[PDB]
Design a protein around this ligand. Structure first.
Ligand SMILES: O=C(CN1CCCC1=O)Nc1nccs1
Ligand SMILES: O=C(CN1CCCC1=O)Nc1nccs1
Length: 185
């Protein structure tokens, strides 16, 4: 792809984080802590899952960023509406305001309803995410495999400002402690 020149500097919004997450000083990395991280509750925090938003909001244009997923067993990545539900249980779907892919139990899937199987021959260590607001497109690229396409959501109905979306996943296995990292431009 030739989307690299729309690169944007994403940082994580601490106030949206689940209370067990640890965000680095530079706001470019996030991992699951082994306990509550001693923050106050607020209406922005994702309560049920290890999720956090980017601080940036997008309502126009083309945007691109990259995320490092090295050595993780489970994660979700993409974009979501600013107005997505934060509390309680929900599914990741465009009807609920999410345009995402994930890794879970050694398979990759797109967050459609129901979920869609992805076909990835080279397990990615870094994911590229491209949003074209006007076109209604969210695309995912395998940086480890020469930028090969993973998935495209089209005819998207964003219906509001978009935020970068992250889920570091639970660590029940002891094998999913590694962080998500926003990669340098
Ligand atoms: O999105 C905005 C402002 N907007 C709209 C168009 C571009 C821009 O910068 N403000 C919000 N405040 C709280 C929720 S969204
Ligand atoms: O779901 C959509 C479009 N829609 C319908 C409801 C909200 C929204 O964004 N596009 C897809 N592209 C690939 C698989 S689903």
């Amino acid at each position: 792809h030739h989307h690299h020149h729309h690169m944007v500097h994403i940082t994580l919004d601490r106030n949206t984080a689940n209370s067990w997450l640890i965000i680095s000083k530079d706001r470019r990395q996030v991992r699951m802590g082994d306990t509550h991280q001693n923050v106050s509750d607020n209406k922005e925090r994702f309560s049920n899952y290890p999720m956090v938003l980017g601080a940036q909001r997008f309502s126009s244009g083309k945007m691109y960023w990259e995320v490092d997923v090295t050595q993780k067993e489970a994660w979700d990545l993409g974009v979501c509406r600013d107005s997505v539900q934060r509390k309680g249980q929900f599914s990741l779907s465009p009807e609920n305001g999410f345009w995402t892919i994930w890794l879970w139990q050694d398979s990759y899937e797109a967050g459609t309803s129901p979920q869609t199987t992805l076909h990835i021959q080279v397990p990615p260590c870094q994911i590229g995410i491209f949003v074209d607001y006007e076109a209604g497109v969210v695309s995912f690229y395998n940086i480890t495999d020469h930028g090969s396409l993973i998935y495209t959501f089209s005819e998207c109905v964003f219906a509001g400002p978009l935020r970068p979306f992250f889920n570091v996943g639970f660590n029940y296995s002891g094998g999913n402690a590694a962080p998500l990292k926003l990669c340098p431009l």
